[PDB]
Enzyme design. Structure first.
Site: not given
Ligand SMILES: CC(C)(COP(=O)(O)O)[C@@H](O)C(=O)NCCC(=O)NCc1ccc2c(c1)OCO2
Ligand SMILES: Nc1ncnc2c1ncn2[C@@H]1O[C@H](COP(=O)(O)OP(=O)(O)O)[C@@H](O)[C@H]1O
Ligand SMILES: [Mg+2]
Ligand SMILES: CC(C)(COP(=O)(O)O)[C@@H](O)C(=O)NCCC(=O)NCc1ccc2c(c1)OCO2
Ligand SMILES: Nc1ncnc2c1ncn2[C@@H]1O[C@H](COP(=O)(O)OP(=O)(O)O)[C@@H](O)[C@H]1O
Ligand SMILES: [Mg+2]
Lengths: 272, 272
Positions: A6, A9, A12, A69, A98, A120, A122
């Site tokens: 979960a 965004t 799965k 995760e 995301t 994704g 961004m």
């Molecule tokens: C938070 C995570 C683990 C969540 O997983 P998901 O994307 O699967 O939901 C994932 O999105 C992730 O690793 N994101 C990037 C986090 C990161 O490393 N950011 C870098 C960063 C770089 C610069 C920064 C800062 C953060 O805060 C302020 O200045």
């Molecule tokens: N059906 C959809 N709806 C929204 N975003 C999608 C879809 N399919 C692919 N994406 C893209 O995949 C990204 C999320 O990837 P994902 O690996 O599932 O991340 P998270 O674990 O953060 O949910 C979204 O930010 C978007 O760019």
């Molecule tokens: Mg993820």
């Protein structure tokens, strides 16, 4: 019997019945509809992972176990790579969700070696600001055939008739050509291609940098950010190859975490 | 008697008279006005560097010698650090120009260890697309007090009531909160703060990653991208410190290349 990742965004879901997987996605926005679905099944245990796992667990009466995760992703990806004929001694994996999380797998376990907020989220968010499109399929379809030329600056644009210190065709500055084209029609397609461009270039740059640091040629790319986005896949693959690394994409790679949760739950059972 | 770093966006000029420097900037767009100025001086030799050095050389009758910008930047920066009381054994330097170039200085010489197209050009270009502002002072002033909260997604937004695997306050996704705030007034100030945010976060992420790889705690930041941009300086400094490195800014750091060209020309004279 169900693995759920979960995320920020997408939710799965991997349903296992008769030694075959059934894959489902739902928007994290619609998490209540995942609970609705769960309440119509005959599931005896939830194997959860991802940021929103707690929300599902607290809103349903089915026993649940939660897994971190990074370990769930690494394990599910290991399974998928072997199923798909890849026997890699080591690799970086970049989880382009995301946001983007980077990991080094040494053959036995993963560690996180970096991350960046270019992923994704961004693509969707900056995409919306430049195009007003909220629908993901519309957004990504619009981007595919966009022309980044009037928006991105290359090394040769700066160095002109002088041989440059690094290859001339490299992007020098994302969006750096905009001020040279102020009468240009910055079309939504062109703008969105540039957004996908910068996200891809940054992810790949970070992945190839940690690949060098940790002495591996292999980079595996997962995450739903690649779904319906052939341009992103190409930007990433091309630059990975240009920097002397080998890119891998994985069928159902976005479901690595969900598969890993199911597997981890299985093998959590042991004794000494 | 003159050092000129003719970059992608600004032409940096260092005039030496009576053992004191005089610093000048002109837009690369206005390169013809630099030639005009040169033609009114009594200069016997041009010490050039940067992508547009060839253009100046070919349009004026003054003898000129050209130096590669990476070595000229590294040398001028070495001089400036010592002048300013820093005696560093080694460091990364990140040259945040139109684009961003990363270098490891081992105490004796530099090598380029990476680069990324997130820098000053993206600030201007993506800034223009989100705000229609072309004037650099207007653009950067507008950004300073922008609020990134409705635009950027943090780790805690994804993980909510669950303790996250990395700190909750970290940016998870630049622009990743936009779709959660679709009724929001995305003000020009707020949007521009987010542009500066993503450029700063990416630069810093890459700099701290190569700092780890090359085993140095020191990161020196130069480039005109920091001029009139206190927000950028803060984003970079803060994250550098958070990741256990020491950030340094240099008075007149943007003129490193121009100073280095003058110095390199001096010492090019020798014999065996
Ligand atoms: C938070 C995570 C683990 C969540 O997983 P998901 O994307 O699967 O939901 C994932 O999105 C992730 O690793 N994101 C990037 C986090 C990161 O490393 N950011 C870098 C960063 C770089 C610069 C920064 C800062 C953060 O805060 C302020 O200045
Ligand atoms: N059906 C959809 N709806 C929204 N975003 C999608 C879809 N399919 C692919 N994406 C893209 O995949 C990204 C999320 O990837 P994902 O690996 O599932 O991340 P998270 O674990 O953060 O949910 C979204 O930010 C978007 O760019
Ligand atoms: Mg993820
Ligand atoms: C080109 C340089 C040296 C010019 O110097 P200035 O900025 O001082 O004018 C400077 O802007 C720079 O180093 N820019 C970044 C170049 C770079 O390393 N880009 C990375 C990159 C990453 C991904 C890519 C890609 C290029 O091309 C296609 O995919
Ligand atoms: N007066 C100015 N005009 C335009 N850009 C400026 C100015 N002052 C600072 N900048 C910023 O500095 C960046 C250029 O930095 P610089 O180190 O001079 O790069 P280059 O060597 O590529 O010219 C610009 O892209 C912009 O973000
Ligand atoms: Mg420069």
């Amino acid at each position: 019997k169900v693995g759920i990742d979960a995320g920020g965004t997408l939710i799965k879901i991997v349903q296992e019945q008769d030694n075959q997987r059934t894959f489902k996605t739902e928007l994290t926005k619609n998490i209540d509809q995942v609970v609705e679905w769960l309440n119509q099944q005959q599931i005896e245990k939830l194997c959860l992972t991802g940021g929103n796992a707690g929300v599902i667990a607290e809103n349903i009466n089915i026993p649940a176990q939660i897994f971190v995760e990074f370990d769930a992703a690494s394990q599910g990806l290991g399974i998928l790579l072997k199923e798909q004929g890849h026997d890699l001694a080591d690799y970086i994996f970049a989880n382009v969700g995301t946001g983007t999380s980077l990991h080094y797998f040494d053959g036995q376990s993963q560690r996180r070696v970096g991350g960046i907020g270019t992923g994704g989220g961004m693509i969707q968010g900056l995409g919306y600001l430049l195009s007003q499109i909220t629908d993901y399929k519309q957004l990504t379809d619009m981007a595919q055939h966009g022309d980044r030329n009037t928006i991105d600056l290359k090394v040769r644009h700066i160095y002109k008739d002088t041989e440059p210190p690094i290859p001339g065709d490299l992007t020098a500055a994302n969006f750096g050509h905009v001020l040279h084209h102020l009468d240009a029609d910055f079309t939504p397609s062109n703008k969105l291609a540039a957004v996908i461009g910068v996200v891809g270039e940054v992810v790949t740059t970070m992945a190839i940098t940690v690949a060098r640091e940790f002495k591996t040629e292999n980079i595996v790319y997962i995450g739903s950010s690649f779904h319906n986005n052939a341009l992103l896949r190409k930007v990433v693959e091309d630059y990975t190859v240009l920097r002397g690394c080998k890119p891998y994409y994985v069928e159902n790679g976005a479901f690595s975490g969900a598969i890993g949760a199911l597997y981890l739950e299985k093998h959590h059972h042991h004794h000494h």
